């Protein structure tokens, strides 16, 4: 029933959704999500925040939503998923376009 978290999906922002770092996290109980920008703490605000959009049982699909980002937001983004059973960690390179998407 209970299990360690697993980041089954983490990719660079797509053409249709340029301001979102997409992810899929599995875990039981709900894993705590934490981001790192080039190894440094990413303090979440109204400009850069985590939002899980679809919650299907032990599956969590969401984005690191960025509001009007520039080249100053480009870099290495590490997502860490933890619960009391384990830890999973995956990283991506992000390059942000000046338009939301197509």
């Amino acid at each position: 029933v209970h299990f360690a978290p697993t980041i089954t999906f983490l990719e660079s922002p797509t053409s249709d959704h340029h301001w979102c770092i997409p992810f899929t996290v599995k875990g039981n109980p709900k894993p705590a999500l934490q981001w790192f920008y080039n190894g440094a703490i990413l303090n979440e605000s109204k400009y850069i925040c985590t939002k899980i959009h679809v919650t299907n049982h032990t599956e969590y699909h969401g984005c690191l939503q960025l509001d009007n980002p520039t080249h100053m937001n480009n870099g290495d983004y590490t997502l860490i998923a933890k619960n009391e059973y384990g830890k999973d960690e995956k990283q991506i390179s992000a390059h942000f376009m000046g338009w939301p998407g197509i």
Partner: antibody
Amino acid sequence: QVQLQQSGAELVRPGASVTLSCKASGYTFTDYEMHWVKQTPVHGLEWIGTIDPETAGTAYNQKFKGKAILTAGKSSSTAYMELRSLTSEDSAVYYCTGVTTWFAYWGQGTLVTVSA
Amino acid sequence: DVVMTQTPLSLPVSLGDQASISCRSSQSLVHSNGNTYLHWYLQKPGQSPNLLIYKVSNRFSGVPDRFSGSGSGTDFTLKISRVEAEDLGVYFCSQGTHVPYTFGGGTKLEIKR
């Protein structure tokens, strides 16, 4: 501004105990891991243990078990490390550091001199 | 306990040249989650250690292009292309894979003159 502010230098007599503090600011202290590191010229850098301030859950290096005790003030945003039954082997610079497997944030260090 | 052997202990290198620090683990640093938690730090005299590279090759925010890391499993390297005066200090390797987390002995960078 992520800042780890450590308490001042301590001069403690052998056999006594000292409590070292580390004020964390510029982030949500309770959401991240806190680590303590010891530096000596002979042994170099040694990892003491780690605390998760939300759950108060600890993990220690076997060689610091019973010597060091890690606690966290949740409302105060402060990490504490107690050093018991002090010896000359406990005279070192102690560092509070975070916030994951890599240590991007370090305090200025606390010098602990163990002498009569 | 994982032993981190750093070689050499002292590294003499002329200004503008390249320095090469080696860190050797006693056990594989690949975690079950798939990550290799090998980090590099620089401790300038009188100061607290500073992070240079996290997870074998990733440069920490603000670290110059000149610093680069490589390796896998047990053998690892730190390279500083075109060494500067501010690069002076002790270079440490660290592992965050196995508990207790361990640090290497340190490599003191020396400017040859």
